[PDB]
Curated annotation (Swiss-Prot):
Gene name for this UniProt entry: csy1
Domain of life: Bacteria
Function: CRISPR (clustered regularly interspaced short palindromic repeat) is an adaptive immune system that provides protection against mobile genetic elements (viruses, transposable elements and conjugative plasmids). CRISPR clusters contain sequences complementary to antecedent mobile elements and target invading nucleic acids. CRISPR clusters are transcribed and processed into CRISPR RNA (crRNA). Cas3 and Cascade participate in CRISPR interference, the third stage of CRISPR immunity (Potential). Involved in crRNA production or stability.
Family per similarity comment: Belongs to the CRISPR-associated Csy1 family.
Any further remark recorded for this protein: In this bacteria, Y.pestis-subtype CRISPRs do not confer resistance to phage DMS3 or MP22, but instead are required for DMS3 infection-dependent inhibition of biofilm formation and possibly motility.
Gene deletion effect: Mutants lose phage DMS3 infection-dependent inhibition of biofilm formation while there is normal biofilm formation in the absence of phage infection. Decreased production of crRNA in the presence or absence of phage. Disruption of the entire Y.pestis-subtype CRISPR region disrupts crRNA production but does not alter phage resistance (possibly OLNs PA14_33350 to PA14_33310, and the flanking CRISPR loci), indicating this CRISPR is not involved in phage resistance.
Disordered: annotated span: 21-42
The protein's name: CRISPR-associated protein Csy1
Quaternary structure annotation from Swiss-Prot or TrEMBL: Interacts directly with Csy2; part of the Csy ribonucleoprotein complex with a probable stoichiometry of Csy1(1),Csy2(1),Csy3(6),Cas6/Csy4(1)-crRNA(1). A Csy3(6),Cas6/Csy4(1)-crRNA(1) subcomplex is also formed.
Source lineage: Bacteria, Pseudomonadati, Pseudomonadota, Gammaproteobacteria, Pseudomonadales
Organism: Pseudomonas aeruginosa (strain UCBPP-PA14)
Length: 54
DNA sequence: CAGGTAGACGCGGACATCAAGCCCGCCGTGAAGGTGCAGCTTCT
């Protein structure tokens, strides 16, 4: 199991929905809060979220 | 080559009730997955 690798424990970056045969980069970095009033995303100002793993 | 002016077209009252609306059987399947390693193969 320690020999078996592949995990990354993502938060907001899964390259695999975009044409799954694609060996790209996946990130675990939730973005900064937008300073502009109005729009919002990323599920980031409350109600803590689970972490994907690819 | 022409063909009218005027004025007005009613009120009332009512428009049904009864009873029931089926049963049977079934509903396609085939193809739409990636990653990692062991071993083979081909070439030098």
């Amino acid at each position: 199991a320690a020999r078996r690798v592949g995990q990354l424990q993502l938060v907001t970056h899964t390259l695999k929905p975009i044409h799954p045969d694609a060996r790209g980069s996946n990130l675990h970095s939730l973005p900064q809060a937008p300073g502009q009033p109005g729009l919002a995303g990323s599920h980031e100002l409350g109600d803590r979220l689970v972490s994907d793993v690819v």
